[PDB]
Amino acid sequence: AGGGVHIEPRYRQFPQLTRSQLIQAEFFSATMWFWILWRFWHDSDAVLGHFPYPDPSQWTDEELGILPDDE
Amino acid sequence: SKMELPDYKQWKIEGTPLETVQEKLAARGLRDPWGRNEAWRYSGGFANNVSFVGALLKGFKWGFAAFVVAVGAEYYLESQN
Amino acid sequence: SGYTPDEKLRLQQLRELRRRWLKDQELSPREPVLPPRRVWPMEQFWNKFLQDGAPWKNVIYKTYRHSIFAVTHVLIPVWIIHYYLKYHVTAKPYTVVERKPRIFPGDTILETGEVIPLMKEFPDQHH
Amino acid sequence: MLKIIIPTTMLLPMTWMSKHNMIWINATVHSLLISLISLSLLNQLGENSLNFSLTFFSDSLSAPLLVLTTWLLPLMLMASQSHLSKETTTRKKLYITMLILLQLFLIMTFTATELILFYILFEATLVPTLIIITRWGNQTERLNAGLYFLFYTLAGSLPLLVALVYIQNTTGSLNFLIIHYWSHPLSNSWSNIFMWLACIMAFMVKMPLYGLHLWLPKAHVEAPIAGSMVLAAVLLKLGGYGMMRITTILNPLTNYMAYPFLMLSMWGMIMTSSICLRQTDLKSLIAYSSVSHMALVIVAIMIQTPWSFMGATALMIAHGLTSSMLFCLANTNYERVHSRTMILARGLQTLLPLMATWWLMASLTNLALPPSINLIGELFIITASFSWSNITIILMGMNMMITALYSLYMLITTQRGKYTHHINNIKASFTRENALMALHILPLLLLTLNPKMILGPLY
Amino acid sequence: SFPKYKPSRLATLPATLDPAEYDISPETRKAQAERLAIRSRLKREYLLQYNDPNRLGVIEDPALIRWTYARSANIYPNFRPTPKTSLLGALFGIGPLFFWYYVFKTDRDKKEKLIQEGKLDQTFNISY
Amino acid sequence: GAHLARRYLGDASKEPDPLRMPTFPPDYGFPERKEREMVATQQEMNDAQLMLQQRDYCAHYLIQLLKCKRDSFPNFLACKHEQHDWDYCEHLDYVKRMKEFERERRLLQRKKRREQREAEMA
Amino acid sequence: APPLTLEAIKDRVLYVLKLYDKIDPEKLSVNSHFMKDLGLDSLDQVEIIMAMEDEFGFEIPDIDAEKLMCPQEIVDYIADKKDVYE
Amino acid sequence: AMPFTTTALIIGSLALTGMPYLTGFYSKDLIIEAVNMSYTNAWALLMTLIATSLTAAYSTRIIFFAFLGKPRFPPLVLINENNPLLINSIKRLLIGSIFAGFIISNNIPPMTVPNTTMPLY
Amino acid sequence: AYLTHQQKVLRLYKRALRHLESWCVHRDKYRYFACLMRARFDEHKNEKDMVKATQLLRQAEEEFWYGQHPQPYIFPESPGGTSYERYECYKVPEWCLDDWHPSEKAMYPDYFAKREQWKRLRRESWEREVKQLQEETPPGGPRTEALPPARKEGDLPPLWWHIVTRPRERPM
């Protein structure tokens, strides 16, 4: 309210963006990449899909076991 | 820092992208009625921000460092065991 | 765009009458004088250890205030909810019904000591 | 029950002879003390009604209403302080005499053991209320107010007189206990439905149902501030006691005969709620909301269900408390503004910080929100009506849909927003008011914490 | 062309786009006349007694209590039993009445002939 | 998906109906049906307080997991081998369900082929 | 949040509305009557009327668009509306 | 001039649009693969991916509007998160929005349907 | 009084791009669309026949309504905004000081002393301003909404208490 403001305004100039609140923001900025990519390296499987899609129209007639196709 | 008012003659249209639209209205045959109060809002101090992905890539080179540190962590875990 | 001598006179006179009014709204040095009240001598000692305001004294008063908040708000509530609970609540039946922990094939019991047999032959589907 | 009645009767010479300015003090103090003696009557032995003599008996149905009336008498007593400070000493003592006689007749009605005595004191309430409304009223239409109230109540009551003397001639007695124990099935004979109508319509008259609800709106508006709460509070519930006791002989004919009035209440409690979104007067607003609540209690009675009876028994007390609660606020704002227009003064919270707080929990109690006894009394009726006829919840949901739309609307258009710039005589709230709504709202939650007492006689 | 705006009783055509409000005849320009005069004089009263230190109390116009009367008591003396009035008054005086009565008695008899032989279930509904 | 395209977009009968699947005898070309071996036991998993939704054949790999989960605190990175056994069992059961679906699918194509070549053979 | 002191909005009006380069600053003044002192009608006012109000964080009344013409009028209305009294 | 809020907003936007390993992965991502898996209403199925697309849309709308790079505001620059307590609270919720997405997803007892295999598309 | 052609077109110009800036957001896009030649308003200043002026008004005013946002720009303090009536909660009329009590009266003493002689000035000014307003009031109910000034020295303007003692826009 009174004089001597911390971000005391130079007219139309950058209001002293403290680089400390910058460097903590970059701590968390590196932490988001941490959580997206060291989790990827730790277990890519979560976003990879484990096991594959066994496309039905590629299999054999024994495990499917149709009664003789000629019959 | 009590009201560091700057000179007005310095913050004019020249150099700023508002000159291009000033050229545009020059094609229209006109002069900008206000095109100077925002010269600061075109200078690199507050204008010219990083891209939206660039904003998303907030220090992603530190993420590339995380690449190596995590890979080496698992590599020395497996190598010595 | 028709500002007659009438209402420019009216308007700037209202302006600086209100300016004088606000200059009289400035509370004098003695204002906003408050009356004497009762301050606690223990908190008086704690405050007198913060006028110098060394970081260790600041931290010490911080943890003392957190300590009195804890004693009045953490274990004071458990002083009487436990008395109500294990002596009055549990004095009446079916008040605190707890879900039975998941008894497991292969776990022994503290009192009887018997163990339920472990799960039978797995398919052994190795990865 | 002489223990509580005799102090009230003999209290009268005290007020009628004490000093010109100690009468207020002495009447107040002795009212609080006879209310203290009254709350000792909350005890109820098993299922037996608390008998006292051949003529006086009480039970769990009665006791909350008795201690209610005893608790109120101080309330309008010290609410009268503002409005009667300028009138003559003898008229002041006469006003206190009217209030005391009214309370005496109420506690006589509620403790009545035989029917016709209950009826005599049932009509004995009009005389003090009529006198209070007509003499100490404020505006002009108070005369037509007294006419409407008196004539409506009588036109209801006389058929009940003929019916009661007929019951005495036929059955052999009018004592409550015997006619409950010697009850017989009221058959579907074409004389029996007129018997039922005579025994019911009287109580229905002073329980304003849809259509026959003009006396309350046209009387409570300009009734004296002390009187208005008394009308809105108790004499709508002595009729409820009347139904509570007379329905023991009206079965099983009540099973299908109640249908016309029954629905006339449910749709009724919507219309008087639907009317309740648009009122030019705040007193009329409270009166119409009251009418909605009594339509609710009416449908509570007519189902003849123990849960319906519990919801009712709670509802008379809850509604009376909240209605008088709001009427006190209406009195206070009117007395400060000397008018009763709805949107005359919005945004009163900017001037009276605690008064609109009082408004806030007053409306909240009007909302019937849990765990307040208003909600529990309503809720028992919800359950009973559902078990009665499934769909009833649709109409009653419309009622628990309109109630808050008008209650909080009254807040936003009285306390919230901003003050109207013309009025400038609104002084700081006097401790008399806020004290009286304190004694009104705090016990409303106190007895909420102990709902067994007011829960009902079928417990 | 550009989508033309039409008036409505709920969403009135905005003042700018009515045709006649830009077609003001000089008769209308005179017709507005000195309504600002009488309005400003009513202000003059209001601000006078408001700024008057001698006055201290509620100040109210006839305008408000005119509407109060005409919304509360003026209804009946000027009310006439027109055919329309009787028609719609009876309409919603016995339509919802008998309609709710009908639906309620319908469901009540539904359960009545569903319980006398035992179709309806009363297994856990003891707390009726 | 191909199944919806064949059924919903194309001939509904030609592809299995989800609300109907399966509608066929279990030994549809599957003589001597040895039903799947009982390794999951209802009493054990009721004792484990399992959800009825997950009380499938794979239950054996679920119950064991809880054992380690009961003995792993404080740790959430433990209990991996048997939980990966459960993951592989959920894989085998998902391929089991979809392969039974494709089994009765090609058997439904067999149904149309069969009723068109043995009944409409005239 | 500043009190927007008379000197604060005073600086505002020597940057805005002294932003006007259509008129050279030598004839520009805080009492400048743009219609004849500068030769441009209230027309070539309204546009910048909309600009300056976008800066101060306030809305000039649409009814008060006319007659609101000189820098002295700007500080006048800003001071009375923003209770610029310090 | 609003860096910390920028990073927080970007990662929150990615989270509500199902960021892997984040809160979004064990969230709408899971629910979407479940609704695609489980027998669900068709129109609901297509609608929920349209919803995910719109969730990306407006989440990046605030991104390319607020932090776009063209200043438009009062001449006195007040955009500044210098309050230490504001930073503390924002980061207190921020760590949860980074960590607590998975600091509860695998710790919980196995409680949902474990559909592991499924069509790649 | 009557809104004239000049006032109508001024309001239309004010509302036209307040609006269009919200259409374009970016200030470069602003400046372009505003300089979509501004002389588009001035290209047809020669409208000596006011009938054609009214017809082009039918085009101008009744083209804005659909070139304008269904959700246009509003300012906080502007009506329909965020802070138009936000601070009315904390504002209190000036007469709410007389009800104060000797404890509070002496606990801000000199403030109430200054209010005392301010209301004394009100006392000495009321009769002067009413006698000044009655003498110069034309018959039939003034003539406009313009309020007469204080023509003398040391006197006060008519009806001056309310617009001065009104609560500040930042009462907190």
Q: Smallest Cα–Cα separation from D69: which of D215, D238, D301?
A: D238
Do D142 and D133 meet the contact criterion of CB atoms below 8 Å apart?
yes
Q: How far is D427 from chain I (nearest CA, A)?
A: 7
Read off φ and ψ for residue D56, nearest 5 degrees.
-130, 125
| Token pair belonging to C107 | 């776990």
Task: Give the integer Cα–Cα distance in Å for D16 and D100.
Answer: 11
Q: Considering only CA atoms, give the Rg of chain A.
A: 30
| Token pair belonging to E80 | 């006439």
Q: Which chain H residues are within 8 Å of G19, Cβ to Cβ?
A: none
CA pseudo-torsion sign I149, I154, I160, I165: positive
CB pair distance less than 8 Å for C104 and F49: no
Q: Does A52 touch chain G (CB under 8 A)?
A: no
DSSP string, F24-52: S-TTSS--S--PPP--S-HHHHHHTT--G
CB pair distance less than 8 Å for A66 and F106: yes
Could you give the 3-state DSSP secondary structure of residue C36? coil
Q: Does I119 touch chain G (CB under 8 A)?
A: no
Which residue has tokens 């002495």?
D26
Do B66 and A33 meet the contact criterion of CB atoms below 8 Å apart?
yes
The annotation status of C65 as a binding-site residue, yes or no, is yes
Task: Give the integer Cα–Cα distance in Å for E15 and F26.
Answer: 77
Half-sphere exposure at residue B81, Cβ-oriented, CA atoms within 13 angstroms: 6
Count interface pairs C-G at CB distance under 8 A.
Answer: 21
Could you give the 3-state DSSP secondary structure of residue C108? strand
CA distances (Å), E128 to each of D315, D375, D431, E109, H80, in order? Answer: 19, 19, 47, 18, 64
Nearest to I160 among C17, C24, C32 (CB): C17
Could you give the 3-state DSSP secondary structure of residue E61? coil
Q: Which chain G residues are within 8 Å of C23, Cβ to Cβ?
A: 85
Q: Smallest Cα–Cα separation from I158: which of I167, I145, I140?
A: I145
CA distances (Å), D358 to each of D80, D326, D433, I105, in order? Answer: 19, 9, 10, 27
DSSP string, E93-107: HHHHHHHHHHHHHHH
Q: How many other β-carbons are positioned within 10 Å of the β-carbon of residue D23?
A: 19
Q: How many other β-carbons are positioned within 10 Å of the β-carbon of residue D188?
A: 12
Q: Nearest chain F Cα to A49, which residue?
A: F91
Residues comprising chain F, all counted: 122
Q: Smallest Cα–Cα separation from G54: which of I75, B22, B35?
A: I75
Q: Smallest Cα–Cα separation from D366: which of D440, D263, D278?
A: D440
Using omega within 30 degrees of 0 as the cis cutoff, is the peptide bond preceding H110 cis?
no
Could you give the 3-state DSSP secondary structure of residue C115? strand
Q: Nearest chain I Cα to B16, which residue?
A: I28
| Token pair belonging to D185 | 């099935």
Task: Give the integer Cα–Cα distance in Å for H82 and A17.
Answer: 8
Do D85 and D23 meet the contact criterion of CB atoms below 8 Å apart?
no
Q: How far is A28 from chain F (nearest CA, A)?
A: 24
Could you give the 3-state DSSP secondary structure of residue A9? coil
Do B41 and H75 meet the contact criterion of CB atoms below 8 Å apart?
no
Task: Give the integer Cα–Cα distance in Å for B66 and A34.
Answer: 6
Neighbouring-strand partners of residue C115: C108
Task: Give the integer Cα–Cα distance in Å for D35 and D77.
Answer: 13
Q: Smallest Cα–Cα separation from D110: which of D71, D56, D73, D52?
A: D56
Do I129 and I156 meet the contact criterion of CB atoms below 8 Å apart?
yes
Q: What 8-state DSSP symbol labels residue G21?
A: -
| Token pair belonging to D215 | 């006396």
Half-sphere exposure at residue F16, Cβ-oriented, CA atoms within 13 angstroms: 19
CA pseudo-torsion sign I47, I50, I52, I55: positive
Read off φ and ψ for residue D83, nearest 5 degrees.
-80, -15
Breaks (C-N over 2.5 A) in chain I follow: none
Which residues lie closer than 8 Å to I30 by C-beta, 6 or more apart?
I17, I20, I21, I24
Nearest to G18 among B8, B12, B31 (CB): B8
Task: Give the integer Cα–Cα distance in Å for H32 and H38.
Answer: 10
CB pair distance less than 8 Å for G11 and A9: no
Task: Give the integer Cα–Cα distance in Å for H74 and H79.
Answer: 10
CB pair distance less than 8 Å for E22 and I54: yes
| Token pair belonging to D146 | 């007294």
Q: How far is B68 from chain A (nearest CA, A)?
A: 10
Q: How many other β-carbons are positioned within 10 Å of the β-carbon of residue E126?
A: 6
Using omega within 30 degrees of 0 as the cis cutoff, is the peptide bond preceding D371 cis?
yes
Do C46 and C64 meet the contact criterion of CB atoms below 8 Å apart?
yes
Do G9 and G79 meet the contact criterion of CB atoms below 8 Å apart?
yes
Q: What is the largest CA-CA distance in chain H?
A: 57
Measured N-to-C along each axis, helices D89-110 and D236-246 cross at an angle, to the nearest 10 degrees, of 20
Task: Give the integer Cα–Cα distance in Å for C54 and C62.
Answer: 12
Task: Give the integer Cα–Cα distance in Å for D149 and D214.
Answer: 9
- Exposure string for D87-118, b = 16+ CB within 10 A, e = fewer: eeeeebbbbbbbbbbbbbbbbbbbbbbbbbbb
Q: Smallest Cα–Cα separation from D326: which of D361, D298, D370, D294?
A: D361
Q: Which of residues 3-22 of G touch H (CB under 8 A)?
A: 12, 15
Q: Which chain G residues are within 8 Å of I78, Cβ to Cβ?
A: 59
Q: Considering only CA atoms, give the Rg of chain E.
A: 30
Nearest to E32 among I2, I126, I161 (CB): I2
Which residues lie closer than 8 Å to D151 by C-beta, 6 or more apart?
none
Going by their DSSP bridges, the two strands D57-58 and D50-51 should be labelled as antiparallel
| Token pair belonging to E102 | 């009908």
Chains B and G touch (3+ CB pairs under 8 A): yes
CB pair distance less than 8 Å for E100 and D395: yes
Q: Which chain E residues are within 8 Å of D267, Cβ to Cβ?
A: 96-97, 100
Task: Give the integer Cα–Cα distance in Å for I168 and I92.
Answer: 9
Q: What 8-state DSSP symbol labels residue F8?
A: I
Q: How many other β-carbons are positioned within 10 Å of the β-carbon of residue G16?
A: 23
Task: Give the integer Cα–Cα distance in Å for D306 and D312.
Answer: 10
Task: Give the integer Cα–Cα distance in Å for G71 and G17.
Answer: 7
| Token pair belonging to I32 | 């372009």
The chains found to touch C (3+ Cβ pairs under 8 angstroms) are: F, G, I
| Token pair belonging to D456 | 């009902």
Neighbouring-strand partners of residue D114: D175
SS (H, E, C) chain D: CHHHHHHHHHHHHHHHHCCCCHHHHHHHHHHHHHHHHHHHHHCCCCCCCEECCCCEEECCCCHHHHHHHHHHHHHHHHHHHHHCCCCCHHHHHHHHHHHHHHHHHHHHHHCECEHHHHHHHHHCCHHHHHHHHHHCCCCCCHHHHHHHHHHHHHHHHHHHHHHHHHHHHHHCCCEHHHHHHCCCCCCCCCCHHHHHHHHHHHHHHCCCCCCCCCHHHHHHCCCCHHHHHHHHHHHHHHHHHHHHHHCCCCCCCHHHHCHHHHHHHHHHHHHHHHHHHCCCCHHHHHHHHHHHHHHHHHHHHHCCCHHHHHHHHHHHHHHHHHHHHHHHHHHHHHHHHCCCCCCCCCCHHHCCHHHHHHHHHHHHHHHCCCCCHHHHHHHHHHHHHHHHHHHHHHHHHHHHHHHHHHHHHHHHCCCCCCCCCCCCCCCCCCHHHHHHHHHHHHHHHHHHHCCHHHHCCCC
Task: Give the integer Cα–Cα distance in Å for I136 and I79.
Answer: 37
Task: Give the angle subtended at the CA of F41 by the CAs of F36 and F46, to the nearest 5°.
Answer: 140
Q: How far is G60 from chain A (nearest CA, A)?
A: 23
Q: Determine the number of helices (DSSP H) and then strands (DSSP E) in chain I.
A: 8, 0
Which residue has tokens 């499987």?
A45
Read off φ and ψ for residue D175, nearest 5 degrees.
-65, 140
CA pseudo-torsion sign D185, D186, D190, D193: negative
Q: Smallest Cα–Cα separation from D78: which of D116, D40, D20, D23?
A: D23
| Token pair belonging to D247 | 């329905």
Chains B and H touch (3+ CB pairs under 8 A): yes
Q: Nearest chain G Cα to H77, which residue?
A: G1
Do I45 and I38 meet the contact criterion of CB atoms below 8 Å apart?
no
Q: How many other β-carbons are positioned within 10 Å of the β-carbon of residue A36?
A: 21
Q: How far is G67 from chain B (nearest CA, A)?
A: 20
Do G19 and B13 meet the contact criterion of CB atoms below 8 Å apart?
no
Do D131 and D137 meet the contact criterion of CB atoms below 8 Å apart?
no
Q: Which chain H residues are within 8 Å of F87, Cβ to Cβ?
A: 114, 116
Read off φ and ψ for residue D112, nearest 5 degrees.
-60, 140
Q: Smallest Cα–Cα separation from E52: which of I130, D346, D300, D252?
A: I130
Q: Does B24 touch chain I (CB under 8 A)?
A: yes
Q: Smallest Cα–Cα separation from F47: which of F26, F32, F62, F27?
A: F62
Please, which experimental method was used?
A: cryo-EM
Residue positions of G annotated with a catalytic role: 41
